[PDB]
Amino acid sequence: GSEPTFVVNASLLPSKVLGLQVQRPQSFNYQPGDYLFIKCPGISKFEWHPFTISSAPEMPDVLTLHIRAVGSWTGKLYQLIREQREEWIRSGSSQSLPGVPVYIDGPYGTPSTHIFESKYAILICAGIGVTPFASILKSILHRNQQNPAKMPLKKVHFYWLNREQKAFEWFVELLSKIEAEDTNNLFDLNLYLTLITGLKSRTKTGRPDWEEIFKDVAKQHAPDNVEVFFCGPTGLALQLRHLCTKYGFGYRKENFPWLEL
Ligand SMILES: Cc1cc2nc3c(=O)[nH]c(=O)nc-3n(C[C@H](O)[C@H](O)[C@H](O)COP(=O)(O)OP(=O)(O)OC[C@H]3O[C@@H](n4cnc5c(N)ncnc54)[C@H](O)[C@@H]3O)c2cc1C
Ligand SMILES: [Cl-]
Ligand SMILES: [Cl-]
Numbered sequence: 001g002s003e004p005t006f007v008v009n010a011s012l013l014p015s016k017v018l019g020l021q022v023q024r025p026q027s028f029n030y031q032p033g034d035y036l037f038i039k040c041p042g043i044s045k046f047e048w049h050p051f052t053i054s055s056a057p058e059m060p061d062v063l064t065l066h067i068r069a070v071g072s073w074t075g076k077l078y079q080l081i082r083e084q085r086e087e088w089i090r091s092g093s094s095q096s097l098p099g100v101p102v103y104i105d106g107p108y109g110t111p112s113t114h115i116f117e118s119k120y121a122i123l124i125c126a127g128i129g130v131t132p133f134a135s136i137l138k139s140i141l142h143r144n145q146q147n148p149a150k151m152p153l154k155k156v157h158f159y160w161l162n163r164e165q166k167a168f169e170w171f172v173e174l175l176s177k178i179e180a181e182d183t184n185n186l187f188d189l190n191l192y193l194t195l196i197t198g199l200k201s202r203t204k205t206g207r208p209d210w211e212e213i214f215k216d217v218a219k220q221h222a223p224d225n226v227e228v229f230f231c232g233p234t235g236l237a238l239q240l241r242h243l244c245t246k247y248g249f250g251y252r253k254e255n256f257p258w259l260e261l
């Protein structure tokens with residue numbers, strides 16, 4: 001039904017995000033891109049909410065979630081965590097920071113995990129939609145270091161769109177590490193504010209020209225299959241779906257209601 005466990009650490013990140021570390025049960029095996037449902041009895045005894053696991057399964061003791069405060073339950077959890085921590089800076093007491101019991105239900109799979117069996121992949125995300133791809137990019141790094149022979153993936157085109165510049169900070173370190181360690185040019189990283197991030201990669205501005213992007217990527221990889229993976233709003237999905245048909249790219253019909261405009 002679920003595993004009892006605890007928040008072991010947290011962070012308060014820009015654009016209203018709660019970075020959460022949760023102790024990983026001995027039984028909990030997952031794949032990059034998976035999500036779980038979480039219950040926090042302190043916020044609500046009975047509600048379960050889904051979040052993508054932003055950590056990689058290669059990381060041994062903790063699971064990570066990046067939860068954006070957009071409403072009632074997420075807003076309360078953010079507030080609970082902040083207030084416990086604000087009381088700690090004053091009191092300095094262990095009593096001001098009790099530890100947060102939670103229950104987790106998972107893992108639950110998604111088709112994005114099939115990136116590991118693809119040759120060429122496009123990854124497109126908006127806002128907090130980045131989280132499955134954060135997990136996936138980390139796991140790719142672990143896998144290439146541990147056993148490069150065993151991975152068929154030859155090129156990853158990554159696109160991350162944000163309304164607010166400060167949101168890129170959620171994963172700026174992971175993206176720096178990729179830039180530093182990608183000697184063989186596995187990754188093509190693209191950041192769009194809809195270097196500028198302090199990365200080698202220049203933050204671009206406006207809505208990407210998806211027709212031009214897809215055209216270029218099709219030329220790079222023809223006549224092979226390219227797989228498109230997406231986590232964003234529906235108006236964008238419609239555009240991408242049309243373009244996948246036009247260029248013969250793999251598409252999964254999925255919707256992400258928490259990312260709508
Ligand atoms: C597979 C999966 C993975 C996910 N991964 C993540 C993740 O990594 N990170 C993440 O932050 N989130 C993720 N989500 C979304 C997440 O599960 C949260 O439940 C949701 O984002 C917030 O719940 P809430 O109670 O705080 O907000 P809610 O109160 O439900 O608010 C939801 C939204 O709907 C609007 N709304 C609420 N009530 C009403 C109403 N009565 N009338 C009209 N509009 C209303 C709110 O303004 C808000 O914009 C994921 C969801 C799924 C299904
Ligand atoms: Cl492990
Ligand atoms: Cl918003």
Ligand SMILES: [Cl-]
Pocket residue numbers: 043044072073076
């Ligand atoms: Cl609630």
Ligand SMILES: [Cl-]
Pocket residue numbers: 069070071072075
């Ligand atoms: Cl809020």
Ligand SMILES: [Cl-]
Pocket residue numbers: 223224225
């Ligand atoms: Cl072919």
Ligand SMILES: [Cl-]
Pocket residue numbers: 234260
């Ligand atoms: Cl819609």
